Amino acid sequence: REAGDGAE
Amino acid sequence: SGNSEADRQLLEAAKAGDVETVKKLCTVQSVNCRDIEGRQSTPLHFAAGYNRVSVVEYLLQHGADVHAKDKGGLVPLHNACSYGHYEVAELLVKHGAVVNVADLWKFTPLHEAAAKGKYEICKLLLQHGADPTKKNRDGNTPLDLVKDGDTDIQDLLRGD
Numbered sequence: 001r002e003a004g005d006g007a008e
Numbered sequence: 009s010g011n012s013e014a015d016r017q018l019l020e021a022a023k024a025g026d027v028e029t030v031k032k033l034c035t036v037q038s039v040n041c042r043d044i045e046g047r048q049s050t051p052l053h054f055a056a057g058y059n060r061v062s063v064v065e066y067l068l069q070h071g072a073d074v075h076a077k078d079k080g081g082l083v084p085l086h087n088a089c090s091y092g093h094y095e096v097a098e099l100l101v102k103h104g105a106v107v108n109v110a111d112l113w114k115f116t117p118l119h120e121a122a123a124k125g126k127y128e129i130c131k132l133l134l135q136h137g138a139d140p141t142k143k144n145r146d147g148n149t150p151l152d153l154v155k156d157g158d159t160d161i162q163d164l165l166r167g168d
């Protein structure tokens with residue numbers, strides 16, 4: 001399950 | 009094409025948080041365009057994931073689609089919750105985002121916020137009826153995804 005676009 | 013380069017620059021501006029460039033380039037064609045070479049994200053997905061509050065606010069006021077799904081079924085609210093961006097999550101909910109939306113794996117925004125341990129986002133989602141007992145396709149509820157070490161969030165999701 002790959003992450004959506006963004007960053008913490 | 010004219011539209012394709014402009015779409016690209018708009019997606020880039022949304023990721024970068026450059027609201028003046030976003031305003032310059034936002035058209036009916038571009039506002040909900042998809043990032044065809046990536047994961048089919050819209051400008052709003054990018055603005056949400058990268059914590060670009062002013063851009064989110066601009067996009068929401070100019071017709072951006074809060075319900076748009078990326079190739080994995082993620083909506084912008086999922087990106088906000090998985091990356092821990094509270095103001096964005098709040099804005100999206102205030103503009104009609106459905107807190108119980110599920111991606112292709114049946115993960116909801118609360119599964120994401122619970123795993124990340126973000127108190128204020130978990131509270132926002134719970135106050136708008138997010139279900140802490142909903143199983144994803146691993147059989148895990150959002151309460152199950154709370155890190156075992158994270159007692160404060162466990163308590164919050166238990167509710168009652």
Ligand SMILES: *Cn1cc(CCCc2cn(C*)nn2)nn1
Pocket residue numbers: 002003004006007008
């Ligand atoms: C699914 N997924 C990917 C990531 C991190 C991707 C790289 C990154 C982005 N930002 C701000 N910091 N690191 N998390 N979840």
